[PDB]
Symmetry: D2
Subunit: 106 residues, 4 copies
């Protein structure tokens, strides 16, 4: 349930994808990431603890997760259809979403 | 967190939108729908009760939720912006995603 | 390349998908709909001839086309994977984007 | 019309968004990038002239453009709402799509 725990689960499963052998491994990891992302959006990060839940900073923080869930969905199509290289390449593009949110609120 | 309960909160909040006057009411209903959707995809429907979580059928079952969440995300842009009518029209288009899943797994 | 011709293209190719025998016929028809959608969005519909290109109605008019292109994209995943029936059902959900615009602007 | 011209349009307008002062400049530049993306996806790049138009590389080539159009769509929400800064940040998240495609196919 914890924001820090959700970030650890996102971190571990991202590496899993990068170095996966089969599609079953990639799909398992992406589904775990989707769970963590769904649980993370409702949390308030330390940096934004003083700002209202309707601030333009709390929008955007939530928005980051909608984008990530969209990317996971897209990777899932590729993994399920046995394109393991394409799935791994797509997963590499998640980092961009990771980095942009971290550069503002981490 | 029950599948039936999450469906109720989805069904209720969609009617709230239809009858809303201001944008703040729309934002509040869409956030609740997003939480329910994020909570419902992990559950197993009575029609697939004998199927494994990593089975092919469970994969397409979760697919409808990925599409739903992206439509809530899109509607949220309009509601946060203050475009009440357009947000209501966006919310209406959800009904098709609701319908398609129900045809297959209900 | 005018609005009416592009609407004929979308209409015809949607029938092609519904009556398709194979995935290759589905791929071909989705490609043609993507080209039609890409060519249609810059046009001005007769009912908004009095409005500026930069106006809330014209932003909304073009929006319907980003949604359609996104749905075509999703359906192409399914047809490239060889999932013909799933791709035919996904193409059916396009109809709601068709009707949403038509109710406002046709 | 040809792929090189399309790529210059994308490049020029991306710089314009970075250096933009008003929402009107961002709107116009994002719209021009949407048209360029739409005219680019049907071409065949030099490095894939020897491959089949139904090959996984050609599928992946076209796919990069659907992702870009979705990101331009996303940024236009922010720009049409007058929100210049976050429309500009959204526009930066788009380089990751530019780079993934050049890293494999340019
Ligand atoms: C890709 C999807 C992501 C990976 C991999 C990681 N994140 Fe994040 N993240 C975000 C915040 C606000 C924090 C700080 C939370 C706090 O300080 O309490 C983090 C933190 C991490 C961490 C460090 C965890 C630790 O205790 O050391 C890791 C390893 C991590 N994140 C990996 C915010 C966001 C965010 C905003 C919307 C996104 C999209 C991501 N994080 C994505 C990723
Ligand atoms: C699959 C991807 C689904 C999507 C998307 C939506 N729903 Fe659903 N819903 C789904 C199932 C499998 C069921 C049946 C579960 C059961 O055993 O009863 C339902 C059920 C409902 C119900 C009936 C609830 C009840 O207790 O009888 C309603 C009112 C309902 N769903 C509404 C609904 C709405 C409004 C949605 C979109 C906004 C929607 N659902 C999406 C599966 C899926
Ligand atoms: C707005 C975003 C639209 C979307 C999405 C779709 N259509 Fe459309 N269509 C639209 C307009 C404004 C019009 C009127 C054009 C005019 O100059 O009068 C239309 C018209 C049609 C027609 C009739 C064309 C004619 O014979 O005059 C058809 C058959 C049609 N549209 C089909 C169609 C389909 C199948 C779509 C979904 C894939 C669709 N349209 C989307 C605006 C919009
Ligand atoms: C693949 C799906 C691509 C995406 C997404 C983007 N680009 Fe691209 N670009 C791509 C190819 C295959 C090529 C080479 C074409 C050739 O004839 O060699 C390019 C090339 C460019 C160039 C070079 C222009 C020139 O004179 O040769 C530029 C400046 C360029 N691309 C910019 C660019 C930008 C800014 C993008 C993101 C918005 C982008 N490209 C995406 C393939 C793909
Ligand atoms: Zn995709
Ligand atoms: Zn939108
Ligand atoms: Zn999908
Ligand atoms: Zn968005």
């Amino acid at each position: 349930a914890d924001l820090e725990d959700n970030m650890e689960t996102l971190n571990d499963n991202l590496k899993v994808i990068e170095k996966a052998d089969n599609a079953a491994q990639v799909k398992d990891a992406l589904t775990k990431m989707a769970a963590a992302a769904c649980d993370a959006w409702s949390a308030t990060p330390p940096k934004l603890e003083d700002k209202s839940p309707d601030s333009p900073e709390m929008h955007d923080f939530r928005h980051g997760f909608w984008i990530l869930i969209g990317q996971i969905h897209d990777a899932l199509h590729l993994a399920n259809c046995g394109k393991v290289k394409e799935a791994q390449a797509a997963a590499e593009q998640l980092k961009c979403t990771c980095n942009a949110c971290h550069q503002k609120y981490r």
